[PDB]
A paper describes a structure:
To investigate the mechanism of DDM1 binding to the nucleosome, we determined the cryo-EM structure of the H2A.W nucleosome complexed with full-length DDM1. Three-dimensional (3D) classifications identified the class of DDM1 bound to the H2A.W nucleosome, and the DDM1-H2A.W nucleosome structure was determined at 4.7 Å resolution, in which the local resolution ranges of DDM1 and nucleosome in the complex are approximately 5.2-6.2 Å and 4.2-6.2 Å, respectively. In the DDM1-H2A.W nucleosome structure, DDM1 binds the nucleosomal DNA at SHL-2 and SHL+6 by crossing the superhelical DNA gyres. In the DDM1-H2A.W nucleosome complex, only 111 base pairs of DNA are bound to the histone octamer, and the entry/exit regions from SHL-5 to SHL-7 and from SHL+6 to SHL+7 are disordered. These results suggest that DDM1 binding to the H2A.W nucleosome causes the nucleosomal DNA ends to become more flexible, as in the Arabidopsis H2A nucleosome. By contrast, our cryo-EM structure of the DDM1-H2A.W nucleosome complex revealed that the N-terminal tail of H4 is located near the ATPase core domain of DDM1, and is captured by its acidic pocket. Consistent with the conserved role of the H4 N-terminal tail in the Snf2-mediated nucleosome remodeling activity, the deletion of the H4 N-terminal tail drastically reduced the DDM1-mediated nucleosome sliding. Our biochemical and structural analyses demonstrated that DDM1 binding increased the flexibility of the entry/exit nucleosomal DNA regions of the H2A.W nucleosome. These results suggest that DDM1 binding changes the structure of the H2A.W nucleosome, although we did not detect a direct interaction between H2A.W and DDM1 in our cryo-EM structure of the DDM1-H2A.W nucleosome complex. Intriguingly, the DDM1 Lys208 and Lys342 residues were crosslinked with the H2A.W Lys147 and Lys140 residues, which are both located in the flexible C-terminal tail. The structure of DDM1 in this study is similar to the published structures except for the loop close to H3, which was disordered in our cryo-EM structure.
The histone H2A variant H2A.W occupies transposons and thus prevents access to them in Arabidopsis thaliana. H2A.W is deposited by the chromatin remodeler DDM1, which also promotes the accessibility of chromatin writers to heterochromatin by an unknown mechanism. Chromatin remodeling factors are proteins harboring an ATPase domain, and promote the translocation of nucleosomal DNA by distorting histone-DNA interactions. We now report the cryo-electron microscopy (cryo-EM) structures of nucleosomes containing H2A and H2A.W, and the DDM1-H2A.W nucleosome complex.
Numbering used by the authors:
A (entry chain K): 184 to 395, 407 to 476, 485 to 675, 710 to 724, 743 to 758
B (entry chain C): 26 to 113
C (entry chain F): 19 to 102
D (entry chain D), H (entry chain H): 60 to 149
E (entry chain E): 59 to 135
F (entry chain A): 61 to 134
G (entry chain B): 23 to 101
I (entry chain G): 32 to 113
DNA sequence: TGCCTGGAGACTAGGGAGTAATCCCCTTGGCGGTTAAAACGCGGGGGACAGCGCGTACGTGCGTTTAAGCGGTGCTAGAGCTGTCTACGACCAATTGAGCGGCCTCGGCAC
DNA sequence: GTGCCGAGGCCGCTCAATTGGTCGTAGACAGCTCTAGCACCGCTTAAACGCACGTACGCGCTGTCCCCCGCGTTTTAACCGCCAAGGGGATTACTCCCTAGTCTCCAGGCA
């Protein structure tokens, strides 16, 4: 009864929906901080649904009769969804899409826009490209008295020129809306703190001290100065005991050795003498990049010279690199059990390689990347989600997956590799792990033993530990071993990520 | 100091440039004076043509287009500047 | 599938067209295009050779605008406005 | 090295009523610098040719004559003779 | 104003320069200078061949006209 | 070639055209003769190429005019 | 006085023949007369400039070669 | 002062069977001296451009590479590297 | 030594074109002069053998440069007396 | 082949050449997305081009005149070299003032 | 009518221009020798001129295929913004050994 009364009275015109308890408490906190005039950072959940609390907070302003212009900056991929959500949750709120090219700029700035504040003023939805270009032409012709921005992890530094355009703001109001707020270091937290509260986080000299007996107590002291208040101040609830609807999920990391042809290539390369050996067979300076590339598959270097646009026979690919042939037997396993298998990778130069492998193996070609346009992207999504379609592969670039594609219908996923950004991997697995899954998705990451990429993975774990701190305050897998590991922890050549939640 | 000859370029700076160029073992006293004289004639000539062009096109600015037009119009400057290419 | 574009033809057909139009040419033929590829290429290696000579002399394996403008001077065509 | 303020003051001398742009100063400074270089190099080479350990006004006039175009060169030699007479008067 | 597209031109210059000699690196200023030089040479040859064609009592330009101008200039490698 | 002492009077006329009381010596006159021959024969070769481009066996003066204009000195 | 007439019609004829010219038109002669007077006058202008540089009252092959080199005409045969 | 004796030695060592005329001697001496002048001037000029006070075999390297076209430059740089290595060893 | 390193250093000092030249640079430059003289005289001798005469003359030299592509490219803007 | 002039071997004293240390703005295979350009199709109309008649201007042969060219001849103004001595220019210490970097205003110009 | 933004005008600050003097020496100058250009003459003969004449070729016109040009339309690549972690140039300073200068012995290149 108290929750219903609060949601009704505090939100007199939230006409098109309802608010659950804890984010409603978040709304009352937001309202109080607006009464305190302080802006805050929203990062609550991996898109649980946030627009709901956006209307929850904003409609209170209209209910009080506090008319004032509203500014929103959001990624293009979700602007229409956001308008549908705001219309659904309150039909009583005026809003408009401010997108299109200079022609739609012209028509909107001719018709929909009054200088004076009034109830006839609708919510103006401006996309990112608008934020980069239209600074002078609009941000100076409006004292935008309400500003809210989504996907707030967009500003990773103080040099993202989105931010240099934004310094042309009348930034009285703010609401940073994002997901996970930590991006690989301290720089992006500092940037977002400056954006949200420049008058408070004025200088980085004091907080610069914490890029990395009494030091153990100092960890709380790092929290004590700011994060002891930030934790109530940052509206975001990690799941301690609320969404037990989240199904069971586990993921394992392999550590098998790497085969011969690539080790002789890397012996040539570490001395920067690979081109000398290929010259005998028939000069890339960025050594770490070539190390990664060789870790993927040797073809790239042949391919550097090559000319074998059409590439030599498949059994060679089988015989060069050990990780791909272990991938071959594991996909034999998965097709034996007939699961829907998701594959992800980082560079097209290997995406095409295993696409060619899968095609020549007699399997259907399912390739989606940033190079293909949008309508065929959804048609391939529909084909994959089709029950009558027996295809068990969806070749998707990891980076291109940031458009919010929902492919939870798959039953298994195979993360061939992992990127330097760990949360990027988290959305990569979230593409199928979101609520609605029916089967126990099981994920394997392929890591090359005795390789620098092991160190890349270890520092990825270091950044994961940084995530956890910010939040809180070599065998070959045999048939028996794999059946043991995928029963429906710690071992030689295989490691499962220990429970990242510190106890139920 | 330049008033001793009635010129308007840095006799000292052009002297230092001859010296630092080490173009010869020995430098004459009036050599910078004549260098400044020829340079001031050149500058006056080119700026005069630039001003005439500005008057001709009813404009109160001199721009690289102005410079290029002046060079390609004046026969003497064209001869002096054969392989001349002007940015913008 | 492996791909490697032609590059040398990257100077597009309209690029040649308005190069000629800026040059005052009115009516053009077809093989002008490939001939212009050839001309641009050959004009390119000369200045490239001069520039690489100066880069080697400067002990540096990067090119610089000073070396570029000196090279253009050496081939006998003065370019101004870049401080050279 | 910069002559920019001297380009400014020569503009004031000739036509102070007419403006000038940043790229214009750049191109004028390039013109002044490379004409300086050409005159100096021609004079130095000719001094090497005549086995004279000195460079002075006389070889500068002959270098000016050999490098400048005809009409502008007779104008230059006239004004420079006037200038060297003025400097000799001191 | 630049007339040839900058990114295609940078591929051209990078690839050709790599061919001639190894381990090279350019910058924005070097690319811009090369662009200006190429535009200048092309426009010069084009005006030369336009004069050649108009001398030829003809209005359509052909590579034999181009090659004529090339021969009088003499920079054939 | 051309006749030595006729070219000699021509050079004398050219000299007295500019500024007088100048003396010429034999190797200088010879060098002038060789240089003039070289430049003129080269110009004729260029004009012959221009004419064969012009699809006519005859060379007219506008051939030479074109060659000079292309060469860039006037 | 009007000494350029010394350059005779058979002279231009044979020089064009050396140039490989097969068929010479009638108006070539005056144009050749011109181009030679301009070329020679630039050369002589440079030569007299150098002789003035030499403080001497005669013209020598040495600074003649200097002038020809300056005119982008480089000559071998006189040092 | 010329290189008459040294060219005589060169011709007798490479093509002992054919002599040279006086005029041919003089013109090829002019050839040698003109290359002399252009190399010295180019090396000095590039040293001055480098703002470098002294010249060495490396500036001679860059000057020779500049003024010699490809195949001739390759042969010249090979023989020059051999000569400088011989001088270093001796 | 083939060319006079001492005397060529004497002319190079006479030019006084810098503070002082390299140590091995004079030997280098004598060597490069020797090389270039080598090919030019070699092709002059080839032309003479083509004509079978005991003295190489400016006509043979001019033929050599005008006929060898690379040498002519080096000496494009020069003419030989007679 | 004579010799005398320059060419070559040895000691020392600096100062450029190389070597070691330190930093950061530049580089690299991928993505979204966004425009203006660029690639392909087609009708056509202008021009490129083959062929013919002409009549006129240039190549060819030969008689006729012409001065360029060879061989001396005299002569002298100006070049090539040398001795002097004198003014002028390199080197160095103290001084400043005008040239160079930062800061700000205000008028021309597409809109 | 206007606002916006880059050039014109402002001051503060420092190192090279200035002055004076000294002293060493390159040029200004006079003067000589000689020689090479220069005016002059004469003889000789290949060469230039004129002219008739033929003929072939520039030219102007005619007549026919073909292929850029414009225009339209559909694709897509440049251009931009951004992600990722490191390295080659920039810069500074130290050190040390190469050789300029010099002197002394001797051989080779010009006449």
């Amino acid at each position: 009864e108290t929750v219903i009364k609060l949601q009704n009275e505090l939100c007199p015109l939230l006409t098109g929906g309802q608010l659950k308890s804890y984010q409603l408490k978040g709304v009352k906190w937001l309202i109080s901080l607006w009464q305190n005039g302080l802006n805050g950072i929203l990062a609550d959940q991996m898109g649980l649904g946030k627009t709901i609390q956006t209307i929850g907070f904003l409609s209170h302003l209209k209910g009080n009769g506090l008319d004032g212009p509203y500014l929103v900056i959001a990624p293009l991929s979700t602007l229409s969804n956001w308008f549908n959500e705001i219309a659904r949750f309150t039909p009583s709120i005026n809003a408009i899409i401010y997108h299109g090219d200079k022609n739609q700029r012209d028509e909107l700035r001719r018709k929909h826009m009054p200088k004076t504040v009034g109830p006839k003023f609708p919510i103006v939805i401006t996309s990112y490209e608008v934020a980069m270009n239209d600074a002078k032409r609009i941000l100076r012709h409006y004292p935008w008295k309400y500003v809210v921005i989504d996907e707030g992890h967009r500003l990773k530094n103080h040099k993202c020129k989105l931010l240099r355009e934004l310094k042309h703001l009348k930034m009285d109001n703010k609401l940073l809306l994002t997901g996970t707020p930590l991006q690989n270091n301290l720089s992006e937290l500092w940037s977002l703190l400056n954006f949200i509260l420049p008058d408070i986080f004025t200088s980085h000299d004091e907080f610069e001290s914490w890029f990395d007996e009494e030091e153990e107590k100092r960890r709380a002291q790092v929290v004590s100065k700011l994060h002891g208040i930030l934790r109530p101040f940052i509206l975001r609830r990690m799941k301690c005991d609320v969404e037990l609807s989240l199904p069971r999920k586990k993921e394992i990391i392999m550590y098998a050795t790497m085969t011969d042809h690539q080790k002789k290539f890397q012996e040539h390369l570490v001395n920067n003498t690979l081109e000398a050996h290929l010259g005998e067979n028939a000069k890339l300076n960025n050594l770490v990049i070539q190390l990664r590339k060789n870790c993927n598959h040797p073809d790239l270097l042949q391919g550097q010279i090559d000319g074998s646009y059409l590439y030599p026979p498949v059994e060679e690919i089988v015989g060069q690199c050990g990780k791909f042939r272990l991938l071959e037997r594991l996909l034999v396993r998965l097709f034996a059990n007939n699961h829907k298998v998701l594959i992800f990778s980082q560079w097209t130069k290997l995406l095409d390689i295993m696409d060619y492998y899968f095609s020549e193996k007699g399997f259907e070609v399912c390739r989606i990347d940033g190079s293909v346009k949008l309508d065929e992207r959804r048609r391939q999504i529909k084909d994959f989600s089709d029950e009558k379609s027996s295809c068990s592969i969806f070749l998707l670039s990891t980076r291109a997956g940031g458009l919010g594609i929902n492919l939870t219908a798959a039953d298994t996923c195979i993360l061939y590799d992992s990127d330097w950004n760990p949360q990027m991997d988290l959305q990569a697995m979230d593409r199928c792990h979101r609520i609605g899954q029916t089967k126990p998705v099981h994920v394997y990451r392929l890591s090359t033993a005795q390789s620098i990429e092991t160190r890349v993975l270890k520092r990825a774990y270091s950044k994961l530990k940084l995530e956890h701190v910010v939040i809180g305050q070599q065998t070959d897998i045999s048939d028996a071993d794999l059946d043991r590991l995928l029963d429906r922890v710690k071992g030689p050549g295989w490691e499962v990520v220990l429970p990242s939640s510190g106890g139920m | 100091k330049s008033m001793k000859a009635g010129l308007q370029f840095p006799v000292g700076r052009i002297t230092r440039f001859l010296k630092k160029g080490r173009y010869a073992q020995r430098l004459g006293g009036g050599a910078p004076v004549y260098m400044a004289a020829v340079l001031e004639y050149l500058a006056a000539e080119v700026l005069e043509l630039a001003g005439n062009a500005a008057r001709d096109n009813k404009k109160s600015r001199i721009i690289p287009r102005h410079l290029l037009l002046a060079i390609r119009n004046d026969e003497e400057l064209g001869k002096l500047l054969s392989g001349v290419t002007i940015a913008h | 599938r492996k791909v490697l574009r032609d590059n040398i033809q990257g100077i597009t057909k309209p690029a040649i067209r308005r190069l000629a139009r800026r040059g005052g040419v009115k009516r053009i033929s077809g093989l002008i295009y490939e001939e212009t590829r050839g001309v641009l290429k050959i004009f390119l290696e000369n200045v490239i050779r001069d520039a690489v000579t100066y880069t080697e002399h400067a002990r540096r394996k990067t090119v610089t605008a000073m070396d570029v403008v000196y090279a253009l001077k050496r081939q006998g065509r003065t370019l101004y406005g870049f401080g050279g | 090295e910069t002559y920019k303020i001297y380009i400014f003051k020569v503009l004031k001398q000739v036509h102070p009523d007419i403006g000038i742009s940043s790229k214009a100063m750049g191109i004028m400074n390039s013109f002044i610098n490379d004409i300086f270089e050409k005159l100096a190099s021609e004079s130095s080479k000719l001094a090497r040719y005549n086995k004279k350990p000195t460079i002075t006004s006389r070889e500068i006039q002959t270098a000016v004559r050999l490098v400048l175009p005809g009409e502008l060169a007779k104008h230059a030699v006239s004004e420079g003779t006037k200038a060297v007479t003025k400097f000799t008067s001191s | 104003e630049l007339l040839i597209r900058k990114l295609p031109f940078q591929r051209l210059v990078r690839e050709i320069a790599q061919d001639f000699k190894t381990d090279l690196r350019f910058q924005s200023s070097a690319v811009a200078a090369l662009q200006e030089a190429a535009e200048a040479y092309l426009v010069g040859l084009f005006e030369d061949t336009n004069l050649c064609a108009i001398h030829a009592k003809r209005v359509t330009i052909m590579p034999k006209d181009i090659q004529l101008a090339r021969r009088i200039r003499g920079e054939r490698a």
